[PDB]
Design a protein around this ligand. Structure first.
Ligand code: CA
Ligand code: CA
Ligand code: CA
Lengths: 8, 332, 332, 332, 8, 8
């Protein structure tokens, strides 16, 4: 899994 | 499915209040006028069969002084397990009653003029006597059933003792609500164990909320009664009323007007509050905003506007207070 | 190759101990019963030619109160360089002796009943007199040579002075071990400079450990002697013994039973400890667990179970203590 | 376009100074000898039309003790909006004058021997009387116009009052510079409101800097005058001079030599400083470095070398001090 | 480099 | 958006 931000 | 998210919100502003407890005006760089600044990490792991595990760590950000007092995860630090049975959460978090009921506050419980019903009216000695969050909390949220949904929570006091109170911090409460389409209505009941002046006291809180989205505008209101009642007798009661209206201005703009009335029985005084705000969205993540609030304290009341980072203290009894807040809120 | 990782573990539980130093039972929401909750960032940069650079920042998480005391990187904050010569590490971290030797503790040095040999038996005045971690540390770990492997470390005291001790915090130590297939055996020796009652004291620690995995079950044990010896004479010695067995229950389930005996010479008293635990894995990341521990203090002994977040203090001399810990551990 | 970045730098070293305020030598594990250790998150959101929103949260890392005092974002915690009009920044950050002018310090304002002009010479009582950063700051940076570029900043005092000073912390200042090719020159002017001994005082600072890259070597210098002038009379003035030269050694190696002279008028004393350093890059992210510094205090001067994590206090008047710093700096 | 989680 | 490191 790669860390995503609040949205995308 | 499964994912991990690193997110946050940086909301900083320039603020001004015409008078503090000394009668002087105060202005400077403040924070969280539209949304509370925060930094957090969350995730969801699909365990298969509709069963999911999740974690959520969130702490507040203070852009004006770079979190001079340190960074922590006091906003939320939970681990949870969910399925068709609903969701169980363990760790510090908003208690079910405030999590659900603050959703009716058009100013999202932040900024100079949000709904102030959730506060420590009796100067209780518990850590979370404003009834918003709780340590050692275990929560259970049901799934949605044709609009109906409820949540229950329990927080262990762990024998925290102050004066004659030997279960300070204990929380028991929950809510029942109906959420469908443009309609939303909720009823929350909660009791916390605390101490006032070193004497065992029960903090009883009943809150009724509802809102209706008519498309062209949205109507929202809150009714709350908070009563701190000492075992040996004598209680501090305060009734808070709030009615607000919100309206889109087309080009990703929004106008908000909210009125609040705080009837403080203990001191037989009232306070009237009017907040007007405008939110201009440059994007889904970035917005420019302005908040204009007026607070009129009657008789012995000394409530003050919450200009976080500039001044959020009280004012002289019976004094009126006016405040302004202009800033940028950026989510990521 | 090269990569960066953001990871952690949220382990929170409901805990209970039948009695505290006052004789009352204590229960509530605690943390880290199966694995210590943490949040960290680490990375490895391939420099080419078998040479690699790395960093590791890790701090403990307290889900019950949202890290109310603040977040830090006290678990590990290192920068390192490694190659076929082995690995050199700079910064706070577990000292080589504890990093290697706690691996024989079936309860991973956490929860209500882990191996308690690594503790400040003499009430030393150094920051890390439990012999687990050290500030200003420089470590060297050799590569593996046909099972054989060793590690050495040195921590600068930087003239920390307390009473007649002018080199408090200094650490010198290392270990030699053999790790191959189902067999693992280690011998660790270490000495720290400290002060007890303001008097220069040497904390000498020798630890022997070994474990054998028979497949159907695993056997593990620890032998340790910790001696605080004051320069002016008089010492506090304690011998700790531990034997444990672990067994898989097929469907990603595990049962653990560990016995420990602490022979506290200074007070001519003994304490017996028995921990039983079950770990049920819903996935590689999420597990449900239960810990049942019993502690019997003999004569003047006052040791207590470590129910972190609920109660980890001592008990009345000669008192027995029983504790329970049930929770969820989620890694990400 | 739009992106989010999680980054940092871990720079830890072994340091030594031949004498402290007591005359004893001091050595141990320190930090930030080549670059200040840090951890931060930043991002840029393209709003379309050349308009961008951004955030930047950064705090210092202390690898020797794992941020024992806690982690925060005191280095920078800003939200900004930029376009062809330049850039506006809100939140704690380096003030425009120091952000631009410290770029002429070949040792990047860190380690045992950087340029020490930016410090609290008068023992002012403000939080940031070293003129480096400021709380409640609003900055504006212009775009570049044929080499010319400027920056202006204002920090609200928010009525912080100490003694007769009722606007402590207020900052007003900016700079004008020319940056093109191998040439760089800047002039900065700033004034902060503070208090010395409880008396209102103005901290006036003028700084002139320039550097020229001749390819085979780079020349850099700094001229600064810092004057703390009390309203009731009496001032503390100090003039700092610095000239440095840097040169690449081919295989990603760099040699640096910097000389500094601090003329402390208030005590009619001088201090001479010479720093020699070598930086060996194993990669773009990882480097090995060595710093050798000598400080000669004249008469009443008591300045000392900044061996962060080991010793950064002063020395006995007129004493000379020698220091060494060897470590690893890893960026990610 | 993109930040990955504890596993992948 | 995925979180990237100091460089790439
Ligand atoms: Ca402020
Ligand atoms: Ca707890
Ligand atoms: Ca140190």
């Amino acid at each position: 899994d790669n860390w995503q931000n609040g949205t995308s | 499915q499964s994912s991990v998210t690193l997110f946050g919100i940086v909301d900083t502003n320039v603020a001004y209040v015409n008078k503090d407890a000394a009668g002087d005006s105060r202005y400077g760089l403040g924070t969280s006028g539209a949304s509370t600044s925060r930094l957090g990490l969350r995730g969801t792991e699909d365990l298969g069969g509709g069963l999911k595990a999740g974690f959520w760590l969130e702490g507040e950000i203070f852009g004006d002084d770079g979190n001079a007092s340190g960074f922590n995860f006091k906003r939320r630090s939970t681990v949870s397990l969910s399925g068709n049975f609903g969701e169980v959460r363990l760790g510090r978090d908003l208690v079910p009653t405030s999590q659900k009921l603050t959703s009716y506050d058009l100013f999202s419980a932040t900024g100079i003029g949000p709904f102030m019903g959730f506060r420590n009216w009796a100067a209780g000695q518990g850590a979370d006597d404003n009834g918003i969050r709780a340590n050692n909390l275990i929560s259970y949220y049901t799934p949605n059933f044709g609009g109906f949904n409820a949540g229950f929570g329990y927080a262990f006091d762990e024998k925290q003792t102050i004066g004659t109170a030997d279960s300070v911090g204990r929380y028991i409460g929950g809510y029942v609500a109906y959420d469908n389409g443009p309609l939303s209505a909720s009823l929350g009941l909660a009791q916390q164990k605390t101490a006032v002046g070193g004497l065992a006291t029960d903090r009883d809180e009943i809150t009724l909320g509802a809102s209706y989205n008519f498309g062209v505008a949205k109507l929202s209101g809150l009714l709350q009664q908070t009563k701190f009642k000492r075992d040996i007798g004598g209680d501090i009661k305060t009734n808070s009323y709030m009615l607000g209206a919100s309206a889109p201005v087309g080009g990703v703009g929004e106008v908000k007007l909210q009125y609040a009335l705080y009837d403080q029985k203990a001191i037989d005084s009232k306070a009237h509050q009017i907040t007007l705000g405008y939110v201009h969205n440059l994007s889904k993540r970035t917005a420019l905003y302005g908040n204009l609030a007026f607070l009129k304290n009657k008789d012995a009341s000394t409530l003050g506007l919450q200009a976080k980072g500039v001044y959020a203290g009280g004012v002289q009894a019976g004094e009126s207070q006016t405040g302004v807040q202009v800033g940028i809120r950026h989510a990521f």
